[PDB]
Amino acid sequence: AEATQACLPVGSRKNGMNVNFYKYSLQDSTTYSDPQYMAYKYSDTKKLGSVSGQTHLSIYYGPNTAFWNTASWSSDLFGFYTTPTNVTVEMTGYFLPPQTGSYTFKFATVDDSAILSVGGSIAFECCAQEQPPITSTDFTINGIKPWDAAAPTDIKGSTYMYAGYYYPIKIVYSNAKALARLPVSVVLPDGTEVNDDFEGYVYSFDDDLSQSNCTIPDPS
Ligand SMILES: *[C@@H]1O[C@H](CO)[C@@H](O)[C@H](O)[C@H]1NC(C)=O
Numbered sequence: 517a518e519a520t521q522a523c524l525p526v527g528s529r530k531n532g533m534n535v536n537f538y539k540y541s542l543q544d545s546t547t548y549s550d551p552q553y554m555a556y557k558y559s560d561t562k563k564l565g566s567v568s569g570q571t572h573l574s575i576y577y578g579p580n581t582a583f584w585n586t587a588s589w590s591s592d593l594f595g596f597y598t599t600p601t602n603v604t605v606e607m608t609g610y611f612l613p614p615q616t617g618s619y620t621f622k623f624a625t626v627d628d629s630a631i632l633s634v635g636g637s638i639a640f641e642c643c644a645q646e647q648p649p650i651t652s653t654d655f656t657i658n659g660i661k662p663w664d665a666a667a668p669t670d671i672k673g674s675t676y677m678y679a680g681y682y683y684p685i686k687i688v689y690s691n692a693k694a695l696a697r698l699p700v701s702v703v704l705p706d707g708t709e710v711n712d713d714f715e716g717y718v719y720s721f722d723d724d725l726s727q728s729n730c731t732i733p734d735p736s
């Protein structure tokens with residue numbers, strides 16, 4: 517009734533996360549403040565492309581700063597050539613806890629808008645990583661851009677996880693202008709912190725809905 521849903525896919529395990537990119541308008545500071553947009557409606561906009569096997573989850577970009585009202589192009593976002601000054605990105609994969617306990621994921625800051633969803637039927641459905649996004653607004657970290665207020669600082673979300681089970685994770689991040697900043701980390705059950713590089717923890721599987729026992733609703 518209370519344990520977070522996990523999965524156990526049996527397909528060949530791939531390292532890292534899948535990252536899709538989407539059209540986002542320069543200086544649109546309203547669309548990404550809709551919870552429905554950050555949850556799933558981003559997928560109804562123009563998909564630009566995707567990269568796989570991404571293990572470094574943090575977003576760090578700054579333009580030449582001569583104009584804070586023009587787009588700027590770069591591959592700094594996961595090796596994909598786009599406009600970090602204005603873009604929406606969807607990262608998906610499965611987080612694998614090597615120990616049982618509490619996992620506190622964190623955004624040191626959010627610039628402009630971002631989300632973290634953790635669990636089956638929250639981030640996405642088990643064995644269905646690359647299917648269209650589910651409608652859940654049940655964010656583990658809600659960093660949806662707070663309208664007229666300044667960027668938020670050290671916002672956290674905690675998930676209790678059981679060892680050896682794959683937990684679906686989805687981050688949806690958007691930027692409308694200038695800097696792109698989402699420094700992602702997690703404090704593990706033993707207390708140690710993992711910044712940026714999530715290699716060893718995050719994995720992908722090809723979709724396989726024929727596998728009926730993929731969903732584990734109560735890992736305890
Ligand atoms: C960002 O803005 C520029 C300027 O309008 C536009 O040409 C470009 O397509 C935009 N990029 C994305 C990914 O939406």
Ligand SMILES: *[C@@H]1O[C@H](CO)[C@@H](O)[C@H](O)[C@H]1NC(C)=O
Pocket residue numbers: 526727728729730
């Ligand atoms: C779930 O079923 C798959 C075969 O479809 C199998 O590989 C896996 O070991 C099963 N898990 C359990 C706990 O029975």
Ligand SMILES: [Ca+2]
Pocket residue numbers: 627628691692693694695696
């Ligand atoms: Ca910005």
